[PDB]
A paper describes a structure:
However, the GLIC is a pH-gated channel, activated by lowering the pH, with a maximal activation at pH 4 and a pH50 around 5.
A structural analysis was performed on E26Q, E26A, E35Q, E35A, E67A, E75A, E82Q, E82A, D86A, D88N, D88A, H127N, E181A, and H277Q mutants, by solving their structure at pH 4. The key mutants at E26, D86, and D88 were solved at pH 4, each showing a structure similar to that of the Wt. E26 clearly is an important residue in GLIC function, but other techniques are required to elucidate its mechanistic role. E26 indeed results in a loss-of-function effect, whereas E177 seems to have no effect.
Residue numbers in the entry:
A (entry chain E), B (entry chain A), C (entry chain B), D (entry chain C), E (entry chain D): 5 to 315
């Protein structure tokens, strides 16, 4: 079967629509998400047109094999979509109304700069390759674009699901291609990060600073070194839930900066001890007393600077 | 093949039934479960009706290809169900009796607020899309809804398997849809959590409190800091077996609260030492003596408050 | 194609046999095992019968499509078995001899009460659903039930592979079902658990007890607390290799009990120190001296009691 | 299609050959490896024979469906091989030349006794089941057995790929079976184990022995206990990369033995301290001085004994 | 269908082209990458040639089944590529223009010697096996070789995608094979390794060196032993993200060398203490004072030597 012939030299407009049934498995490391949705296609094939009076029927239902159906593919899927045709309905004027239910693992890049307070725009790219007979152009029927109410993405808030109505028409392998951008805007549920990572990480840091109220070198070494190891554990836990970015993430920046606080705390703990042994505890006392104010102030200001830079 | 024609302007009622053969793999993080069950469908196709006297047979057996079968799909499955038709039996009045055996990975949300003492309602949503010829409505044949005795879900107690008999009829893409709710009520087997997480977590906390019966700052620092690290390990162990919730879980609340106990224990240990060095051990003794009663009392009351809030 | 017609009102007896080719991947957490075996089926279809003299051939080979084959399914498989028909041989009395090679992930529950010294009975349930024409009953041809010599299950000893010859005939959805039980008896290779978990776990415990020969509170705190953390690591390592049971496992019981030994050791270490500071080292000496005998004796007796209760 | 008829009462000899294209994913825990290779089959079917003069062609190319092809299966694959027929060429005498390209996950047991200095013999078992018409026997055409130069197995050295030319002919289910053994000899690349596990493990042990040059019980307790925990971490790291063997592995033996060294070091550290408190430091000095020589000597001799026993 | 017949004794030239649509999942441990691309094939079949005047059409579109298509396979894929034919267009002279969209998991070895500052050349090997009728030779149509702009490989920089235009023609199983090399040059995004592994690893090492400004053996033991354990954790974290190489990697070399620094620091800490107890603190002071300069200088020079050797 060949494509529908043109009235003039116009291209064939295939009206599209994606209706999300299920949404799930957003893999941060892999930068992928799984989707289960309705795909709707509609185009005019004058060859399939009929008189409702003569035929008796108001619409004709065809099996996929029987008629010409445009080869609609997804640009950013890992493997070809697992589709099952729901219905094909031809109107008297030849307006075909195709509907399929698909499932696919979509590969869409993620921006982790403000993690875990980040928001993302997941993409679904519909594409059609023009045939030698005639050029095929994609369109968005906004009435067939949407999502089910029940849809939820674990640990994410689904903001919107819209389509960029004007297609990206370009040449590839000397043939026209019509690309459509379906955008699923989501924003991370940062809540859990606060009692699981942020607050425990701050508690261990504050525990390290109790060495500014101790003259016992042995106790201080234990305090600063132990807490530093707990901070390593938190850093490792965090980097496992994320991919390797060629940029600094918000949480990444905080965690890294905290290493410098542990480093300088060790230096202070060392200096205080050296001076005490050197029989200069008056100078050591001045340094320790200052550190009690310096460490939280410099920590608080550095964090304001980071939050400012990142948001 | 087209759908059965109506007697009047009535919709076609497809009677359904799910009989669970096997149940397994409830993924808490992914909020999914795998099912292996019987699907039964029954509708009246007057076109397939026959006289038992003339034909000789009491029922006629057809191959799926031969007759019209309603396109029944599952709303919340990840990928299309892996089904194999067991039997299709037509009665003389045209009452078709379809049976298939399926397996699917069902996506049903879980409520972790009372974890690990939580109970869940897993869902299986049957759906049918109405055709242009006529509207299709789902029904529950309670005689064909059930589960095998042997069925067990690892680490869960299967309470019930029922169906919400009245379907959720709605419009989607200008077409009628009939949705049915099959509910599998389950409740978690919290036993193992007690000797593996809860009791070990309490033991390390109680060990930290022995610093209230020690004047040795160095020993106290070791006691409170070490146990705190074991508590971090338990927190990390727990959060790996669970997804990121935008709410606090029962175990999550307990674990978080325990961090504050370690923090205040460090403050006490620090205060006691500062005072001792300051040549005020009488004041330090008062604080330590109070802490011996204060720490378990405030812990016990805080837990009563939490259990009350959560249950 | 319809089933073979009966001579009298007898049911159709389908003789079965499973011959294990490969055995592997027993998942303790998932309570599943993968199998790769021969499936043999044999039934009498009088309609396929022929004259050897007239036809020339002694047996006729048919393609699965050509003749009626009973719908034999496995009850406890996750997804439908991946089968490939090896041969179908019809004798001229109409005795069909079907053989297929399959592979499946079988879901069979495991009893961890005596882990790692446990033994299991893995099951393979053959099932047939009776048709409206006539009832189908399963049988075991003991000559076609067995396993290859090479077969081995990693970390397990394969004891036997037998079939419960009398089928479980019952009604389900107003139709007769014939269920057969193929049992693969296995017993765990507990060897590795001794030098990897049991002995290292005992060594750290015995190390903690050296605090009964030390008056240094600071050293004792280090000894008991450190070893307790190593015991947490061993407990966590063990629980990862196992599913959450609503009962206590043998290793689980030992590990849990050991926590109480660490708890009481801390109490002793604390008591001894308090008394020493209180200028009562004579009483502290009595307690420490007793503990040296009490701790191993109570440990040894408690273990005898556990081993007795568990075996 | 039936098998080729025999000239006399001889069996049909199917000449085989495996040419490895790609080799990869040797899973030590699962005892499996993935293969991507050429399968070649050649047998004489006199029914397909032709005169080159009359026909014009020197060889005839057939589609798999058109002619009889022997049912060649792999014994030790997990699931049936993913094969794609490359070519089928019939010579004038009826000598069929079949070639397919396959990929399979082969299950072959591994001997970890000398790990990580072990060598293995991976197996690929070709099998054919004889038909009721005539018996089928496998043969090795050594000219069609080999491997690509590029082939490499990550972390392994590929020694050889040969076939045991004489098949294992036996009865199974009253039918003849011809089994062939394709052996892929490999030897582990033990290099990485030296700077990652062996040397770090020895360093921590030697660090523990510095307690023989210290009279500080508190420091010694820290030295021996800390290093012992690092040794636990190494033992756990090792056992994760390996399956549970009912025998001792070389690395397993070394690691286990090292636990005894830590145990005895604790005993020494304890004894030395007890004696010092008991105001007998002369006796404690003798024990400590001996331990300085005893510990490395006994360690070195024990290792010679192990290496001897294992190799 | 047989291959196109030759004009003279020339081989059939199949012009190829790969256009990368999506690139992803480069597994360092498995040494694999997933690809989603366009495959284009073009050859001359004179049998399909036609007069544009007589036929009316300028090009003819065929279904894969209808005409002869060369059996093009990938050498280094794990399993056979998942391909879907996009278009087949025949020109009047018989120049066939085939296009398919594929997805495959390509196995290409990686060189980790300069990790994480390494660069790689991923390969895609196109291969064709010559038929008995005539020899088939591959060619590169440079106009149909490329990649989409959007293409990105997570944690990698895509440098180029070119093809080695002259094929590797060789004999295999007495038949000609034409192999083509498609090279995807990539270079690692080493950024993240600096704040996550390199700098934290240096910080803990520098913390260990504060023991050169402390006379407290107990504090020094804590400093050097604790930091050494954090270094073990970093070594383990690194080796999990990498496969077992029979060579030293850059990061591997640094990490290994750092163990020697911890070992010698322990020796210094031990020596200093022994001398102090031996009432020789003047000699111990000389050693400690030297170590303060020696340790960073020898560390810095050793690193220059390593960087030099590795780059
Ligand atoms: C002379 C003393 C030898 C000690 C040998 C210890 C044997 C342990 C055997 C374990 C077998 C499994 C229970 C662990 C106790 C550790 C030993 C404490 C030593 C105290 C030294 C006091 C010096 C007078
Ligand atoms: C303490 C740590 C001790 C390490 C034991 C050394 C290994 C060994 O002794 O292992 C022996 C292996 C096995 O080589 P093979 O050819 O298979 O021996 C077969 C010989 N027969 C047939 C006679 C039995 O030799 C090697 O790979 C030697 C180089 C590795 C040295 C690593 C040292 C660090
Ligand atoms: Cl697609
Ligand atoms: Cl479905
Ligand atoms: Cl509505
Ligand atoms: Cl409607
Ligand atoms: Cl099955
Ligand atoms: Cl096979
Ligand atoms: Cl391929
Ligand atoms: Na079509
Ligand atoms: Na149908
Ligand atoms: Na059949
Ligand atoms: Na065939
Ligand atoms: Na310490
Ligand atoms: Na073809």
């Amino acid at each position: 079967v060949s494509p529908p012939p043109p009235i003039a030299d116009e291209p064939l407009t295939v009206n599209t629509g994606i209706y999300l049934i299920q949404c799930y498995s957003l893999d941060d490391k892999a930068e992928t998400f799984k989707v289960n949705a309705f795909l709707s296609l509609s185009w005019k094939d004058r060859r399939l047109a009929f008189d409702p009076v003569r035929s008796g029927v108001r619409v004709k239902t065809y099996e996929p094999e029987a008629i010409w159906i445009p080869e609609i593919r997804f640009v950013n899927v890992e493997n070809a979509r697992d589709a099952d045709v729901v219905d094909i309905s031809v109107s008297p004027d030849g307006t075909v109304q195709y509907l399929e239910r698909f499932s696919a693992r979509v590969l869409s890049p993620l921006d982790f700069r403000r993690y875990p307070f980040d928001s993302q725009t997941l993409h679904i790219y519909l594409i059609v390759r023009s045939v030698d007979t005639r050029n095929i152009v994609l369109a968005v029927d906004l009435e067939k674009v949407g999502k089910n109410d029940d849809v939820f993405l674990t640990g994410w808030d689904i903001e919107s699901f819209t389509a960029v109505v004007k297609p990206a028409n370009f040449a590839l392998e000397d043939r026209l291609e019509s690309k459509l951008d379906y955008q699923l805007r989501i924003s991370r549920q940062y809540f859990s990060y606060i009692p699981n990572i942020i607050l425990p990480m701050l508690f261990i840091l504050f525990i390290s600073w109790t060495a500014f109220w101790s003259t016992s070198y042995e106790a201080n070494v234990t305090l600063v070194v132990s807490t530093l190891i707990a901070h390593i554990a938190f850093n490792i836990l965090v980097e496992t839930n994320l991919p390797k970015t060629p940029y600094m993430t918000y949480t990444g920046a905080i965690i890294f900066m905290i290493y410098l606080f542990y480093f300088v705390a060790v230096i202070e703990v060392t200096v205080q001890h050296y001076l005490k042994v050197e029989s200069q505890p008056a100078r050591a006392a001045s340094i320790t007393r200052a550190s009690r104010i310096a460490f939280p102030v410099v920590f608080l200001l550095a964090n304001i600077i980071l939050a400012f830079l990142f948001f």
